[PDB]
Structure 1
Amino acid sequence: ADTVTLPFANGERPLVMYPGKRPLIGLTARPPQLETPFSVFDEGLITPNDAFFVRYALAGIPLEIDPDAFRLEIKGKVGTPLSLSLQDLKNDFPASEVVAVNQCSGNSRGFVEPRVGGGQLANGAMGNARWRGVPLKAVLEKAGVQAGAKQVTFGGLDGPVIPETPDFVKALSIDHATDGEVMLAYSMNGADLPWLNGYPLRLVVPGYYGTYWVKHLNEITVIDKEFDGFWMKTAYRIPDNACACTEPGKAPTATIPINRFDVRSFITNVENGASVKAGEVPLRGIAFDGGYGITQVSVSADAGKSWTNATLDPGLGKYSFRGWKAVLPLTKGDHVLMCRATNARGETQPMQATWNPAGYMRNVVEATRVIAA
């Protein structure tokens, strides 16, 4: 039936409908991987549950869950091992909330040049939601972390089809896990987690790439060494340098795990070749970073020759999409519109795209050609 075409080579995808979801861009069926149509980001600041993107590494996702039998296990280098029900979590601990962007490591990989292998995503593998749950800090304090603790590993209900394939397990440093922001989220936008977004419980790691946000989370292990599981040691690595980048075609000499978002911004109310009325053209869109706050968003209508200051919306917190609005004088004819954001620690977007072998962390200044009449 319905298809879309993403604007890169071999960009054709089916529009697919999953239970509880609107039609989305189908990347893969087994495991399910769904990208959000770009138009959704112009609908409002919080991404709806039924539009939220889905990424999974392994096909053995859970398809039947009894929320009453479900237990989160807390173990390893702790005083008291814990076995917690969802009712335990909701009753015995105080709740927190955070509005936070979840974005895949590989968001926008389809735009990387030269093209690289992996999930060929446009910019729709990101979303912003109100998350509610228990700060991991409080669960870990109850277990009683031992001095000696270095890292916390996180595992979920999903599993590899073939037992030899490495099971999806991630790690955070102990001081990160106990920071008060890392959350055990049982709620997304005031509802239970959509199935494919990790029902009944997921890790939320504000300002960090999505790979850490472990879904169907059932196993937390405090360890006193570095975790050398495959999804930390081999997968999700970036070049160990300031641009997280190498010369096109070159492998890095040193790598580190992907960590915190770089600064991004988009224009959401217009897309390539849109018609606008010559004169005062109203633009709007979004910006986000790794939790330092957006300081400003500049807009350009002459492909980056000159810049206008956008007006920032009232914010929903440092981890949320930050909205912005601008009105630009446009003469009749062609214009290449750009936006560029900078954050409170002075990070900004490069004008020219960088590259790495994985196609991770793209944040180049986005250009949108419009026609003013």
Structure 2
Amino acid sequence: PFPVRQDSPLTEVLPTDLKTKDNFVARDPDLLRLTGSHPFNSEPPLTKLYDSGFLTPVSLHFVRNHGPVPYVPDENILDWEVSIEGMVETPYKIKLSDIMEQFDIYSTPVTMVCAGNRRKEQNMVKKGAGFNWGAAGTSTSLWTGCMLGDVIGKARPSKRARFVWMEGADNPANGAYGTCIRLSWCMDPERCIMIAYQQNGEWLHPDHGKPLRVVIPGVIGGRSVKWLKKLVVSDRPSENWYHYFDNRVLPTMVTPEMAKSDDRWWKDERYAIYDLNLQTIICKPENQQVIKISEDEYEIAGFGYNGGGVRIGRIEVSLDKGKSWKLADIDYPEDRYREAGYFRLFGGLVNVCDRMSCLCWCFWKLKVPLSELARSKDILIRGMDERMMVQPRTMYWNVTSMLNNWWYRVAIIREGESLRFEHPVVANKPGGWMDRVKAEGGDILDNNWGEVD
């Protein structure tokens, strides 16, 4: 009735991982390494992400590890303990077995996305402090677990409390990875924030937080803390190093030099990222794909996602550099779950039907004549949400190069009787229109995306 998937979890640790601190972690070879062999930060290839459909296989899900994966022995897992302390009436410590036994379990489709997705495009303009991501720093899954809200609810947060700090078990360079989320979001059924212990029917792979993680829909991955150990109800935001010095969109005029040499650019919550911005990405045609000109339709296609559970109302494609726009047909598989009423899946209640929010990505398609693309220099795509907030033409360059959501552009190159298509960049190799434009010497932030007229 709606998408469901569980695959075989991988066994083979790859030679590259055998040589590394994560020597016990079986990882899909198709994932594209972005900080070398370790720590593991990866995205699937864009075509495999799209071709997988609404649900990304666990093994192709993107990984973002700031440091090494903490070793977790399966024969002890159920006793994995999490601490609920802070501005509560009744602090307590709960183990996973007791999470499972005492709280209502749900299973829920959730798009995850990294703050960094589409970062390389920023890097091509001006190299910042972050490693390249392509456009596939997103993956969608079914997550099974309880509601953070219920766990936190049980300790009786005080009236002055505003934030739930989360802290993991891992040990990145600057210590335990930790950040926070707002308390009332935890309490809001529409946001549906979980403590998850399964993903696409399987107990968590180590890269995805085994045994236990927070998953915060409509919010950057950065706030979905893996290998969860502490939850601290508080009146103010986290003071973890990783809350301050990562996952912020600093004002465009702030330079890497200014941010290195002034701590307090990082100490204003106004630049701290929670809810994602609206992104739309073109997947068909693919990077470097060639197609013979004819009188036929080609189905341009992609996906889009948004923040705060706000639905994307329209996706629009221009072949004339944004002078005119064509309305794409959007598909929202989350509505399949919504339409379907209550189900039990992987031992959890499927209750999207209780909500109106869009916690997941969606897919769009638009057929145009190959002959219309023949007369075009590019495909552009943008989305607008139900707040009538649209993606910008202009790039918002920022130090961490996060949340880069300016219109995604695929260049159309005429070659005799065919067309070749270039995406902006490939995640870990050259091969995009941006690579070309750098060789030509174009200013990518000019009004023609750095190209010649």
Which residue in 2 is equivalent to 1:76?
Answer: 86
The equivalent of 1:365 in structure 2 is: 407
Q: Distance in 1 between matches of 2:69 and 2:218?
A: 28
Give 1:250 shift.
8.4
Q: 1:342 to 1:140 in 2, by over 3 A?
A: same
Report if aligned partners of 1:134, 1:183 keep a CA contact under 8 Å in 2: yes
Change (3 A) 1:169 1:314: closer
Q: Which amino acid aligns with 1:223?
A: S
The equivalent of 2:59 in structure 1 is 50
Equivalent residue letter for 2:362: R
Q: Which residue number in structure 1 is paired with residue 207 of structure 2?
A: 196
1:176 is paired with a residue whose SS is helix
Structure 1 residues 73, 327: closer, same or farther in 2, change over 3 A? same
TM-score (norm 2): 0.72
Pick aligned residue for 1:146 from 147, 158, 166? 158
What are the residue-to-residue correspondences of 1:1-373 with 2, within 5 Å? Answer: 19-28=26-35, 29-43=37-51, 44-59=53-68, 61-65=70-74, 66-112=76-122, 113-160=125-172, 165-180=174-189, 181-239=192-250, 245-246=252-253, 255-276=270-291, 277-278=293-294, 279-290=296-307, 291-316=309-334, 318-331=358-371, 332=374, 335-370=377-412, 373=418
Distance in structure 1 (CA, Å) of the matches to 2:162 and 2:316: 41
Hey, which of these two has a bigger chunk of helix by percent? Answer: 2
- 1:249 and 1:143 mapped to 2: Cα distance? 42
Letter in 2 for 1:264: Q
Q: CA deviation at 1:237?
A: 2.4
SS of the residue 1:39 aligns to: helix
CA distance in 2, matches of 1:270, 1:312: 17
2:135/2:281 contact within 8 Å kept: no
Instruction: Find the aligned partners of 1:302 and 1:154 in 2 and give their Cα distance.
Output: 47
> Which residue of 2 is the match for residue 7 of structure 1?
none
Decide whether the 8 Å contact of 2:218 with 2:360 is kept in 1. no
> 1:100-159 CA distances to partner (integer Å, 9 max, x unpaired)?
221111112211021212222112221122222111111112122122323211111112
DSSP-derived class of the 2:396 partner = coil
- In the other structure, the counterpart of 1:4 is none
2:262 alignment counterpart: none
Equivalent pair of 1:96/1:134 in contact (CA under 8 Å) = yes
Letter in 1 for 2:321: A
Read off the aligned partner of 1:49 and give its amino acid letter: V
**Partners of 1:128 and 1:295 in 2: how far apart?**
20
Which shows bigger deviation, 222-231 or 283-292?
A: 222-231
TM-score, normalised with respect to structure 1: 0.86
Task: Measure how far apart 1:312 and its partner are.
Answer: 1.0
Question: Which deviations, in whole Å up to 9, do the C-alpha atoms of 1:276-303 show, x marking residues without a partner?
Answer: 3433111221111112101011112233
Aligned residues: 353
Please give the alpha-carbon distance, in whole angstroms, between the structure 2 residues aligned to 1:94 and 1:54: 28
What is the CA–CA distance in structure 1 between the aligned matches of 2:202 and 2:57, rounded to whole Å? Answer: 11
Quick check: 2:88–2:233 contact (8 Å CA) kept in 1? yes
CA shift in 2, pair 1:80/1:230, >3 Å:
same
Q: What do residues 297-343 of structure 1 show as CA deviations (whole Å, max 9, x unaligned)? A: 11122332321111111431512111111101231466411221111
Decide whether aligned partners of structure 1 residues 144 and 117 sit closer, same or farther in structure 2, where only a CA change above 3 A counts: same
Say if 1:150 and 1:223, in contact at 8 Å, map to a contact too: yes
Using the alignment, how far apart are the partners of 1:334 and 1:153 within structure 2? 50
Shift in CA distance, 56/20, structure 1 to aligned 2, threshold 3 Å:
closer
**C-alpha distance in 1, partners of 2:297/2:246?**
47
Q: After the TM superposition, which of the residue ranges 325-334 and 33-42 deviates more from structure 2?
A: 325-334
Q: Structure 2 counterpart of 1:92, which letter?
A: Q
CA contact (8 A) 1:299 1:308 kept: yes
Contact 2:254/2:399 (8 A) holds in 1: no
Report how far residue 218 of structure 1 moved.
Answer: 1.8
Unmatched 5+ residue regions in structure 1?
1-13
- The offset of 1:206, in angstroms, is 0.9
* 1:15–1:39 Cα change, 3 Å: farther
* CA distance in structure 2 between the aligned counterparts of 1:248 and 1:368, rounded to whole angstroms: 28
